[model samples]
Target: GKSKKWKEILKFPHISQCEDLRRTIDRDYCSLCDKQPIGRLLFRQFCETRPGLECYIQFLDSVAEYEVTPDEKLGEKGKEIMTKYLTPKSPVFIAQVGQDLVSQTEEKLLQKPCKELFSACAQSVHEYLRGEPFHEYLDSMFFDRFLQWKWLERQPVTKNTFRQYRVLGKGGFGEVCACQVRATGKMYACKRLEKKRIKKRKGESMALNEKQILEKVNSQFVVNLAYAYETKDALCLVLTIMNGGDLKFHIYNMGNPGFEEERALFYAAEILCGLEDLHRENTVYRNLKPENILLDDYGHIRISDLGLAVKIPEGDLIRGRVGTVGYMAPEVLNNQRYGLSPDYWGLGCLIYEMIEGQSPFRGRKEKVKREEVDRRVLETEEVYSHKFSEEAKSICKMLLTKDAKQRLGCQEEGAAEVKRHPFFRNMNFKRLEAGMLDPPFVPDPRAVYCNLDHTDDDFYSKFSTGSVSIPWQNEMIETECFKELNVFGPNGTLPPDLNRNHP
Candidate 1:
């Protein structure tokens, strides 16, 4: 490949130089920040800037996307330098390259391009910028800025990758459509948000919030995030499809007898397992409502819609009134400082709703006013639960306790305390995690169908946009931002707890 040496690789607007003016341009972003690898590379080049160390983790990661053939001739020597001074496996050398690149930036070593190891490093940078694919690790992978700049010249986005079917749902963010992968024919729920909408208050930031939460969690009882991408004018989140509708739907349709305790116990345990997963990750699930919980054909529940989830560290109190009116905890309703315990209150409401025909505070399909709910939940503290078992009523009373310290799960043991209550005496948590507990009900076959399910007739004129034969142009974009969206965002401002990857 052709070589231009170190000078060409270093040519880019330095954010270190652009640092002071970022505040005046935008609160969250710098004016000089272009999208994708450019913004990422700029941070790498200007590693001494205020956004240095933390941002560089992303910088090293961006380099992995570059396609460079591994040069075996000079590779061994390169590997030696990498091994002696650095520490990492070949394919992923994130922390290794990150710390190494900073060493280069801080030391400000003079270049000696004529030497062997010296020229190889510069050549790596030059080849990277020359748009050559890298199949091997350079001394420090992220040490190349020019390559990132090169990748930026090309648009990269994953669109037209799936066939869009029926619109899943529409909301303030935008439409979530059910889509099927062209490659595997597997169905997925795709949430698409217009670019303009995200710029509005609580728009892009909140979408990023949901994205971060989805990445943080993975469980049989939590909606799995399959993939995420961006278009010229929109952002798309690909999530696992929940075919059996929601718990609220079944509760209403099952007339007269309503949901028996056996049925509620199965679903509630699954929900509790999901809640325990979230709590273990050290986050509080603020939005816990029937509408946000979905069930599959086998009647397993997966907690979905995490738009309001927030991570709370030990000794931390996350405030700002959130969650559904009927399901919100007393402290959350009052805007008091609270932690993971609030979710227990929502759980109590959910368990009651599943067993009875309606939510705790809001009675069965009643046209109750918000004032009434507030009075019963807050002031009068009167609750009706004679319809429930003595154990169920006791657990509900304990969970609904206004005093956080006096609450059932709020004790030091957290969710373990609530789960240990006599109500769940029959549960074996491991079996619940394994989904071995026999479910009390399975969704009716007719009700298990997705509204979007359909076959293409290949009638081009009348064909839906989702027709496989249609030639669709999905916009390409800066994929670097996708990783950024998952890491440092509103949901958790602190560094990522990478424990998800561990055993």
Candidate 2:
């Protein structure tokens, strides 16, 4: 009886007898057919409602039996219909039908003509798709969307051709070494991090993020990530190597009390450019100390180290404890959520250290306790006040504000504001970006005792290497002045005070 009832329903073009069966099948296969039809009569009605289907089916039938050749163009009728309705946002069914036609027709044209024609067609398709609002839509639906396609694969550092030099500096995370690629002979500092160490510290993700961010950033003041690669046991980041060494060494070896306004402004302006770039990208460089600032072969300053850098999403609030002591912002110390403001606070501390030749908030007996230090930073206005020009004082005051809201250099105007100050009036921000601004102070032409010299065995043997260690000294050379000139005067070997106008 059941078999006879189904046969009877199948014979009818449309009837109430088959309605229940159609509804059940349509409900179950709704995703496949898009609820267009369940039987012959409804299918015909659907085709009539969507006129494009006739052209699509016709196109499909023409290519079904015929072998596709790249040189064979889609007829004008097919192209016309495709252009009118086959948009990126159109359903998968449309794309499938189109692809089927192309694939079937071009199946036999694989060797030469077909390939060339296919490429040309793809180019045309891409051009037509440009300015289409369906980019986001295509990305969501396709597994390997156009956005994910990369033209180049990850290339390894070319052969033994990578010239090897000695390590520039060693740290807790890894060691930085000097290298030059053989083909280009471009000198770079290769930061090599041990895979084991990264795993131990749970810093693999941080290192990867740093590489990604650095690759996207291009600024004159900030160190560049020229290349990155990973070996079996280590990850290597090739960066611009600063030859002038760290700012800490520059001040400490001066054997002097501090620097003049001009000298301070020269370096400060460079650093300000670096901060501006970071903020533009919605990133916060928590560490802004003298040690992180290095001098290039041409004596220009560049900021290094992106390991601690964090990206702040647009308009979102970021709150966390980060940064080194003495240089960190008050909000950072207070464990308050903050953003670019904290970095300005660090710039303030750096400015003071450059002028005072010592940390503004250094503890006399022991490192100042966190609570006491916070209180001092809040209560003492003189902490920001220093023996410098009004312009210098003004910049410092803005950077050292206890309330993060009052801090300067938090926006585009912030760095421009610093540039407009009297202290940096002489600096041409544009020229500085173009690498035309000469440094106020240059390392002596013969100042050969840089980080690179550390690799020489004789240097260690003669300099009393590790035995003659000095407190508060992290670098091989205690100060930059020590290398510039041999003199150690009562005012400390004055390293040619380029900014002598202050005193």
Candidate 3:
């Protein structure tokens, strides 16, 4: 039967199955659609041959070897690399390397590991086949043999594919770090959730939920998921790199009175944009705080760390007393069923904090008790300061309404109701969405806002497949302004032009 045969083809392709795979290709049954005959012919031409499968399997073997020994076992592995790919008459020889690189490799044979050794050759093969008729033929395939080949061509992204850099932050389930895709040299933030830790904490569903939600959401105001994959020990979500740091750093650590009113206005509108997108997707961001809002290089905001975010159908209420203490809404604090409205309330608290240098519910004291904050969130009316503009005060008041039904964003139009308020009357939302609006502050490119002294050694030790299991090490960073900053420099000191800010 085609079903049974198709099942065989679905197994991850291997050199051993090349003849069987080619035979299946000859059968050419298009279960997906009838317009796939050319796709099958093209697959036979490019992928069914022994040469192609040999090249692909060699690449896979290289990646597996690299994964097992990213930093060690160099001399033996280097010989295998030359034998499989570099040597003339080898079965899987890659012939596209520059003459200089070949001679350089002969001299520096055991100097670098697999990543540096194979990235150029693999990418050359990728570029060679990615043009013109290949792509058109690629799309016509019934199954994603191209995606499988693409995996073989570039290798599947794993911890091995990226060169880890600075420790970004410690997340609830794992460590978040700055990493660069070695092949493309593009930067990203990797959020790593150790598998065993999630299982023990009973947070499997939440981790999956966040991943699924992020997969569907594409928004400028929200941190985007660039790639999601798993190693043996952890689930990794590669995200857009945000170099400007989190809003909390700006609010509390950048001198006084938080943001200027103009800056706060820009951030508030962008946060609303993020909230509206989540709402449009039927998700409520249960945790909305300055700390959860990150600034990209352009200084615009992206709502992040969707750990407490939940999906709710229209008019359906959910009960969860989960959120940052200061930003918790009254309904959430009361453990009452609510839908979406709590997010608006949290927004109001955030707006209050952005301009006032303190959360509305936390009061003016720097060290208020947790119970006091909860009580204030549930019952106390917020007092706007004299420094607030009339428009700001009015909007904050409406959003902070005690009755969920009467809250600013509770209506059918959702975030639109909040957008129309006079506080944002002069704003051009289209311009904002187009990224044409200037942010009130751009992070100094020379400043490092990340925690410099922290390391994830303890948490990283969980990735123990037990073969000379060396843990995560900071790579010699090759970023913009690369210098001795290349290898984090001796003593881990800041780059000469960079200023370190810690709170």
Candidate 4:
């Protein structure tokens, strides 16, 4: 037997004192027999001599079994044997007990398959172990050990395999590039963060927290975080890239959407749903602006740019002020601890910008101070002078409430309230998720004239140099010396409301 072999090896003085044998026995063998009733007294004495060996001894003691009976007097014989050769006071007890433990433990150690299966069973039990009152010994010792073991075995994250396409945009945290996957041929926006920059800015946790929060949120309105990978010097986060660019750039080309109430509400309501989900998860999306909202290929608005987003786990509400200057809520502007309400306030600002050509709070002057603007935002009781319809203004008014408590959206009441608003009477919040809603506007086919101009400026600029005449000038009809898309007759007729009535 292996136990008899170990016993023979322990007979040598040098081998009995070997450090390697001591370490092996301490780690793997001590627990099986140390707490047996027959072995307990000797085991206690051995532990007392070895001072710090309690960890191994306690583990063995937990698994040891015991029994009581009137007829069995082997218990008495066992107690006598323990006292004679295992007591701390006797010098010979060390040699005898140490040899016995080393030899017996060899058999216990060979039961490797059993140990592994036992460990797995213990874990299954621990996962469902629950109670209000604490189990001090198990909670601090056994349970923690199990958790550490499980954590060590968790699967490593898979590296992303995708190809880069075009540069989307660059910001303080990192650069976002448009990319496509090789396997699926699916397009996505990849946000790349250099390790050096993250280290320099001390934003490792901030970046990780955003990724964790995004992984939990699944919504059409919010940009999705699909996968993440890290290389030698950078971390790459794969996300659903918005191909139509940001609302800021889109509105600039369209020269104000001038969308009707129902049309505008469709997009606005989508943004509200995203905000509600974010708030429910206890995350504050500090940066909410036209530039942060992008259009997917199908023209659905997707909220992106989570660099400034924060997840507050313990509390139901977030506090403290943070966000862009113009779009920040009054509470955030005042340096108060604000929550999800801030996003709604920014939504109001964005809706107003959508309806009008410019921000309601901003002036044309470059030097117009932000503090003065913020104060007016908090104190002003009425709507601004914009051409937004009454229903549109009503929705914006609710979002722009001065008191954070009165703000339109939090997780619970906000979503329902926004859905019930008259402006969104034509919109079905549930249907928007399925991509069934029809868009209000489609680009004119002739609007594709700028296709060649969309390439990199340096490359295309050289080819077009010295051609001062407009590129599309040849398509226009010339009446006299000037190009004329519209002509006045002898009677001098005015063009019908060309802006209002589009064919």
Candidate 5:
């Protein structure tokens, strides 16, 4: 919207009208030969809104009102010729100027704008200019993201800053351990992605892509990324620790009881919202399972592990053998080009699992090979076992539609079709989004659960040639962008150079 509005400034007064005033503005801003450079772009907008022009100040006001200062002539009369346009750029450092001294500081230091703060803010805003946020920007920026960038920048990312505790759990790539930021003492789940493993079987970039997706996703039912950095052997993602454990933990570890229809609907609704958020950005979450669903202390479920997600271009099908077999859609397993339909399939399997103790697919209880499971899914109809509700059975059948084109969410209503299913009759999606709906169960916050039954060493070992071994860093994984960031901060902070390393 900012860029569109900026464009209107060029159109409203219409370029042809100001085309004659090209004398001063044109010379300084849009040289006949070039216009892509940052300075000229800003200056071009600034040059407009002269004394007579349609209140240029009000024009760019919404775009960057905070930075706008009236021209020297506008001094009393109102006007200042901007030497160059000021647009937020990224990879720039963003530090707060100052806040309540009573709370803390290097209190006085906050107000002062030193080299660190300027460099941080400049590149931080500029980074967004080129990032996905900018590409989808209202006026080429998300102010909220900018504020987050600044907040994270102030957080030092040095090794010593965090005092890591025992392993919390393991993931698709590596272990998630408990840790605390020493400076402020904030607890976090440190997800360690194995650099060595990630660099294998086309996983190097896939791992990075997962990180990228996770970085952009920030909502109630999705885990939040606090800080990301790289060590000698791993890429560490500091996330908000969900001590309540995952759905699998509650179902299998705690008890084998199946959730009631109301409980299932509660979780299903939240996951639906999560998928809606991702699909809004044109991403298809190809991987969804009970293991990937987690619960917060209040028992709210969040979707995790995005390793198999793929972006879908308009009218194009994503063809690849991805996702766990039991939950995989028939089309996906056939290696046929597919889209969001697979997500519905996964949801169907999940909803069934919530109401039943197992999958609606045959032979799901006994461990099976990928080919066998794929064959079963392609040749058979879902069996609604465990005497599930008629509503549950109906939605599951619709979602598990044989043909991708005829699936429940395959048409216009999209996920809304699934939401409006008779099973969700009493549900309110908006209320679900705001987390107003009460959960059937809330985990004990005081209880801490760790996936150390397999020691951290034994855990990571199987990921390799199917052997368990202790993790020992042999060397640093270097990238050009890392040099630009002053990690191992004098204040014990680690900059997100690894994140910038994304191509």
Candidate 6:
């Protein structure tokens, strides 16, 4: 084989050469640090590139070339950088940078070098991707995952691979259970959407939607999908285990005036973060209710149950009219073409409910008819309780604005617009997104948040009841079938259920 000779001939560059290039790269790197905090970490990533020394050499060449190249050639160099890193097909394209910033830089690429251009885009990108995209990308690019991905690629995933336990939740489709991988002992929430139920409700596409969305998202404020597979009677989605109960339980069953102002503020900030992330991915979380927000053991909240969420392409408006009635926005209730503003309206109802004990539009009674609630939602305005603070009232008003265009967090700046308000003056949004801030509430470890002994024998008829025999189960397999189907469905069209969910 020629491999031994190739290895002998191809040697790493000299350490001194690497050090020199490092020094040059660090010079521009320091400039980015001075202007933006993400600069230091970005250059650190460049240093860790696969061909470490060679990557530095390439950066050094760009840095050095900028010093002597003429204006016209510099423009050409800009095109080269764009073609390599900024194009839509590039591996690191929008994955590491923001689309808006990339477009902004495109107009100026003819005037700058690759070194300066990336720094400018990186600043804005850091703001948008500061949540988990950067960290997720780092995890993906790192060593262990690369090997694990290929290893999993060779295996076929099946339902029997998991050791199912007590039921954690029950939805319209099926129950969610605490399951463990026999080999690794790793725990996850297995959401089993029954084939019979899906067929009855014609929710096959909706089930697929939830799976696809969960796979694409990863954030501290959003539930994570670990694995997904199918059994003879169900399509199972393995998700992150959040032992703490949902926000609805915390707000209603915990007693007193729902949540304190501080707690409401904390939860609202986290919800806003999750919504912003979804919007950035071109998704609209149609369902945003307290019941859909679950807390982890650490007390932090993550938006869950994305079954009704839809991805609306640019220039296209969604007219789904889907979502819980009380929290639905005026535009959505009217069945108008809508975008991301509806979620903001839902957040307003959530914040109001947190501090006021019930939704703002629930009328004056403890219980109201669905028709009455919808009428109030469409015709009436919220009357703030005597307990409402000026800042809280202001934010609630802005978010609950009937006109989608006037809604808070609905502008071009998205969540940043709402984050700037005095209502969140004490919030450290950066720390919040990084999960550094302490939560206002934590669930009792000893208490069970969901039904444990309840069994629906009818739904369970086709499923395995007893423990999964090791002979029938192999290792947990992270299959690629979903991702493959996610890009383009079986018929090359997104499922027709995008706007079909009506409650």
Each candidate structure's TM-score, on Cα atoms with residue i matched to residue i, is 0.58, 0.57, 0.60, 0.55, 0.58, 0.63
Whose TM-score is greatest here?
Answer: 6
* Model 4 per-residue lDDT tens digits across residues 46-158: 34434334333433332221111111443443344334333556433323235445344334334432212223222222332222112232222222222222222121323
After superposition on all CA atoms, how large is the RMSD of candidate 3?
20.5
Ten contiguous residues with the weakest lDDT in model 1: 468-477
Worst 10 residues of 5 by lDDT: 467-476
* Candidate 6 structure quality by residue, lDDT tens digits, 75-95: 776677667656888653444
Tens digits of per-residue lDDT, candidate 3, 440-463, equal 888888878651112333333332
Whole-model Cα lDDT of every candidate shown, in order: 0.58, 0.56, 0.66, 0.54, 0.56, 0.66
Clashes of each: 7, 7, 0, 4, 33, 0
Q: List the residue pairs that clash in candidate 1.
A: 67-133, 67-134, 68-133, 68-134, 68-135, 69-133, 156-477
Candidate 2 local lDDT, 1-503, one digit each (tens): 12223222212121222333334432222222222111212222233334444443333333322223222443433344344434445442244335655554344343333223333333333343232312322222110111111101112343243566898788877898898754334567878777667667766568766776675566778887766655556667777778776677777765265677678777888898898888778888888888899876667888887778888998886877777766778787778878788778888988888887777677334567776666667666745444677777877877787888767766546566666766676666655666666786677655753423333333223221111111101111122211222222254222222112332
Error of 2 at 44 (Å): 60
Superposed by TM-score, candidate 4 places the C-alpha of residue 208 at a distance from the truth, in angstroms, of 0.8
Report clash pairs, candidate 3.
Answer: none
Please state the error at residue 483 of candidate 2 in Å: 37
RMSD of each: 18.1, 27.3, 20.5, 29.6, 18.8, 16.7
> For model 2, how big is the CA root-mean-square deviation?
27.3
Residue 124, candidate 2: alpha-carbon lDDT: 37
Which is better, 1 or 2, measured by lDDT?
1
**lDDT at 498 for candidate 1?**
20
Winner on TM-score between 4 and 6 is 6
Model 4 error, position 97 (Å)? 71
